[PDB]
Amino acid sequence: FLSLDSPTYVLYRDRAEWADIDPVPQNDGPSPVVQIIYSEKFRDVYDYFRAVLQRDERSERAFKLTRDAIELNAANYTVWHFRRVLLRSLQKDLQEEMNYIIAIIEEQPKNYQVWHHRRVLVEWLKDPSQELEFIADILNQDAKNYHAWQHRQWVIQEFRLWDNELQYVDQLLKEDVRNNSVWNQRHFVISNTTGYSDRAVLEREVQYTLEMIKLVPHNESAWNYLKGILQDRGLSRYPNLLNQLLDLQPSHSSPYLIAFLVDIYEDMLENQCDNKEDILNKALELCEILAKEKDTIRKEYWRYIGRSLQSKHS
Amino acid sequence: LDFLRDRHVRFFQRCLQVLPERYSSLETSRLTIAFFALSGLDMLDSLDVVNKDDIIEWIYSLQVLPTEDRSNLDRCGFRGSSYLGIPFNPSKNPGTAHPYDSGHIAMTYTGLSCLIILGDDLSRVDKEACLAGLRALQLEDGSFCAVPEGSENDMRFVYCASCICYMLNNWSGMDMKKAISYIRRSMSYDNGLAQGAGLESHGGSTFCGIASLCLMGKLEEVFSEKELNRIKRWCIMRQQNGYHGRPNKPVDTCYSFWVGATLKLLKIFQYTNFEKNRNYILSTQDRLVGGFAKWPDSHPDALHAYFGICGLSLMEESGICKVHPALNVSTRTSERLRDLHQSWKT
Numbered sequence: 001f002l003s004l005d006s007p008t009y010v011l012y013r014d015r016a017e018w019a020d021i022d023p024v025p026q027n028d029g030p031s032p033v034v035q036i037i038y039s040e041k042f043r044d045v046y047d048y049f050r051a052v053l054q055r056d057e058r059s060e061r062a063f064k065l066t067r068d069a070i071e072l073n074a075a076n077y078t079v080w081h082f083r084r085v086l087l088r089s090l091q092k093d094l095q096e097e098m099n100y101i102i103a104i105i106e107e108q109p110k111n112y113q114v115w116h117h118r119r120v121l122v123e124w125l126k127d128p129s130q131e132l133e134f135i136a137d138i139l140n141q142d143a144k145n146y147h148a149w150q151h152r153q154w155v156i157q158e159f160r161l162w163d164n165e166l167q168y169v170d171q172l173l174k175e176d177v178r179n180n181s182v183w184n185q186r187h188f189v190i191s192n193t194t195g196y197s198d199r200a201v202l203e204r205e206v207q208y209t210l211e212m213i214k215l216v217p218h219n220e221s222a223w224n225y226l227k228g229i230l231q232d233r234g235l236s237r238y239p240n241l242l243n244q245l246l247d248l249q250p251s252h253s254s255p256y257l258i259a260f261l262v263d264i265y266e267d268m269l270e271n272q273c274d275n276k277e278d279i280l281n282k283a284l285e286l287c288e289i290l291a292k293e294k295d296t297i298r299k300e301y302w303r304y305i306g307r308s309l310q311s312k313h314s
Numbered sequence: 315l316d317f318l319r320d321r322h323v324r325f326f327q328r329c330l331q332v333l334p335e336r337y338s339s340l341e342t343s344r345l346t347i348a349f350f351a352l353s354g355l356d357m358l359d360s361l362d363v364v365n366k367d368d369i370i371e372w373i374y375s376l377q378v379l380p381t382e383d384r385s386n387l388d389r390c391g392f393r394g395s396s397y398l399g400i401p402f403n404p405s406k407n408p409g410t411a412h413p414y415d416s417g418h419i420a421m422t423y424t425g426l427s428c429l430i431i432l433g434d435d436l437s438r439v440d441k442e443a444c445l446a447g448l449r450a451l452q453l454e455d456g457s458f459c460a461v462p463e464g465s466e467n468d469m470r471f472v473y474c475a476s477c478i479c480y481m482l483n484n485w486s487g488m489d490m491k492k493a494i495s496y497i498r499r500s501m502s503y504d505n506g507l508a509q510g511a512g513l514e515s516h517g518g519s520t521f522c523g524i525a526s527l528c529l530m531g532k533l534e535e536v537f538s539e540k541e542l543n544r545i546k547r548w549c550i551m552r553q554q555n556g557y558h559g560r561p562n563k564p565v566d567t568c569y570s571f572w573v574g575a576t577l578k579l580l581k582i583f584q585y586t587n588f589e590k591n592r593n594y595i596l597s598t599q600d601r602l603v604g605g606f607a608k609w610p611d612s613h614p615d616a617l618h619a620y621f622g623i624c625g626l627s628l629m630e631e632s633g634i635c636k637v638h639p640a641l642n643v644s645t646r647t648s649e650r651l652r653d654l655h656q657s658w659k660t
């Protein structure tokens with residue numbers, strides 16, 4: 001209730017209701033290390049916070065003391081935990097909290113402790129009704145916020161809310177087709193629903209992926225996915241894909257494509273294929289092209305594959 | 315341009331000293347800062363500039379100890395800092411019980427790592443306790459929390475466990491089979507490792523997983539050659555000029571280690587571009603205050619200084635000891651531990 005920056009703010013140490021508690025100071029003793037200096041008003045709040053902790057006190061006054069200590073440092077895991085204890089003890093309307101946090105996560109959406117506190121509140125309420133809409137609001141500010149995606153993946157798993165998340169993916173790839181975080185969510189959704197082993201879903205997905213290369217071909221994230229959803233089936237086994245990519249070579253060539261092809265020719269070699277002597281050279285033409293002029297910052301990685309391919313297959 | 319060894323010392327000196335209430339948010343994890351500074355100096359061979367003996371006291375002041383009655387074995391390890399308000403006790407007197415006081419996996423890790431670096435022999439570490447607490451942090455899924463009270467779990471702490479177990483030279487502190495599941499479970503459709511099964515592949519995660527296995531000595535057993543091959547590609551595809559944390563993201567000095575070390579453990583760091591890694595790293599070096607930031611013309615911090623310097627050390631940069639890439643301490647300190655172990659084994 002008493003705002004930390006009200007004119008009439010008063011220290012806890014000159015507060016009537018708090019007269020009876022002896023505050024607890026922090027002491028790092030003779031040599032401190034990475035000492036933080038702390039204001040009057042701060043050390044006060046945290047001197048009383050330590051006291052109320054020491055004494056496992058399940059008061060209201062304590063519950064309010066937490067909000068003030070979270071204001072000064074929302075990184076203090078202990079403060080959050082103790083707030084969660086008072087939420088339990090005092091039997092607090094968890095919805096009032098689920099709003100209190102929504103505000104703080106916005107101000108601090110890389111903060112582990114608040115993403116946790118929101119998760120706990122949903123495990124308690126078993127109510128994901130709020131979650132997907134709120135996470136897309138955080139994702140609208142940072143569409144690669146690892147905390148937000150973690151939470152979203154956990155909600156969608158824990159309350160099997162899969163029905164709309166593929167549409168949401170399709171939307172955020174229309175938004176930034178280069179977002180590694182969204183190509184992940186796509187495979188997360190499919191891999192936990194349809195699964196890829198339906199031949200028809202695979203046609204769907206490989207087609208969709210290629211469209212988004214024709215659209216923007218220098219995009220690791222799309223090629224990663226194409227390889228992803230195919231590499232365990234055997235890149236060799238789809239000869240319409242090999243021939244399709246060879247026809248992009250002139251206009252849509254990227255290190256990502258040339259690579260893909262090497263990885264096809266490697267799988268072909270692995271699946272004792274027709275023309276080891278020949279395929280190998282097709283793969284080495286490419287390892288050399290990569291090193292020579294396509295993917296030069298891996299000059300020596302691609303050279304090393306050249307050596308690795310010849311030693312597996314001669 | 316060129317590496318400001320002298321200033322990078324003056325920098326780490328400062329970290330260890332004092333900071334304003336602007337840094338409030340580090341209170342609950344000062345020991346990790348301490349580590350970045352102290353390994354920082356250890357890595358520049360300028361540890362002499364600190365009061366080792368007096369820091370070793372501070373560190374030990376942070377160890378959570380078993381009580382008279384050993385009820386609280388599950389809650390032992392180290393604290394981030396004294397912020398709970400416990401009487402200063404450099405592991406002299408026994409446990410002083412407190413509902414909420416308990417260790418933190420990252421601090422148990424950074425605490426031990428610091429002590430070894432500083433010279434101390436871990437004699438005052440109650441190992442059985444730290445290990446007991448460590449175990450109590452592991453979940454069904456094989457990953458770890460950071461505190462018994464509950465918290466995020468993910469690959470970071472799998473590493474922290476791996477490192478504690480490695481340093482105490484006693485893997486009793488974890489269920490390695492389950493830990494190893496979590497690591498394997500966590501590989502992505504792009505063959506990078508993620509915070510945990512499902513999530514985005516990420517250079518930090520990827521390190522933690524790989525190094526954790528390398529510490530367990532199971533890297534070879536846990537992933538097929540085909541797998542390690544796909545993992546290596548993921549990692550080396552992270553270099554654009556400086557390495558980035560995850561694909562289609564802009565570089566950061568810190569990954570010039572996270573991914574660097576990953577590649578060095580997979581025995582192919584040699585096939586990276588050294589000139590562009592070095593430029594980019596130095597590109598961030600702050601020439602007025604010292605240290606390094608994630609990006610250039612941009613404010614430097616203890617972590618990005620340590621990791622920049624370590625990521626340079628991976629390229630046998632001049633004036634910086636070889637870093638031990640799985641254990642994240644100077645090779646000197648790693649050698650210093652070999653001995654500390656050959657000693658206990660009698």
Ligand SMILES: COc1ccccc1[C@@H]1CNC(=O)CC12CCN(C(=O)[C@](OC)(c1ccccc1)C(F)(F)F)CC2
Pocket residue numbers: 146346420421424469470473474509516517518519522568572617
């Ligand atoms: C997705 O984020 C990551 C995942 C896995 C590893 C590393 C990172 C990341 C790298 N760069 C950063 O700026 C922050 C991060 C590393 C420091 N962090 C810690 O938690 C850490 O030091 C502060 C740590 C120390 C050594 C190893 C792993 C973590 C602690 F464990 F000691 F607490 C937070 C994340």
Ligand SMILES: [Cl-]
Pocket residue numbers: 577578581582583584
């Ligand atoms: Cl190497």
Ligand SMILES: [Zn+2]
Pocket residue numbers: 566567568569608618
């Ligand atoms: Zn960084």
